Amino acid sequence: ERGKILVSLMYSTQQGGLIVGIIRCVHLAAMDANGYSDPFVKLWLKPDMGKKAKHKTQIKKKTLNPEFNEEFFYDIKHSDLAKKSLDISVWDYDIGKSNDYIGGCQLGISAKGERLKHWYECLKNKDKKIERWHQLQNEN
Template sequence: MFSLCYLPTAGRLTITMIQARNLKAMDITGASDPYVKVSLMCEGRRLKKRKTSTKRNTLNPVYNEAIVFDVLPENIEQISLLIAVMDYDRVGHNEVIGVCRVGNDADSLGREHWSEMLSYPRKPVAHWHPLVEYQETTSSSQGGSCNSLKAPPSP
């Protein structure tokens, strides 16, 4: 469960990771050490990423952590968020427990959540999202306007 909030005047997109429940056990102990990695995407390219703290030994983590991205109003239509719940491992690779996507190019619930956020600016909109298994997709970039997500510095 997470909330989305967009402040068009400030160009600030806030995603608040609230909690997860019934995650898949990834460790031999029957639990996981989950954290959430949020990637700001544009046309299949990752522009920025941020992550939450790791919650140890739980399948029902509670985060209540806000992640903020600067996105200009003229770019909000082109971007999406890829949310990956990861299992932290001290040895070896961190494993993907599952992912979900929100944005105009997302599937039904992800697109609805995004539309609701844009319809109610400055108001956090929270929803539960199911996690799906991660499939790496490669997509060719068709020159868009995602290169300038931050306003250029003024002289």
């Protein structure tokens, strides 16, 4: 068991871009010796591989159910966003050590189940926030 993450999507027509609302995560894997992790989420539109299109949340220190409530924005047209698969990666912050990898999940059309469904519902219903839970399982 390594938890799940509540993600929100909404394409704003007046602003022209995608709003990814990271709400929280629950029941994550304990990556530290104290029994916790220090989770923070990383968002990244995959096929660009350009650094001008990726974000990350603030470091929630010592919590297995972090409460982020952080929105991020990607300036991209609606036709160009249909090509994108937004990657999500939750990590554990170590203060004198490379960050432990907790989990991850990717939202795209080539994916299956709830990922393609969430991306698609984001693509169709605009000026409309769609929320969904996502199980971490990438092992990257």
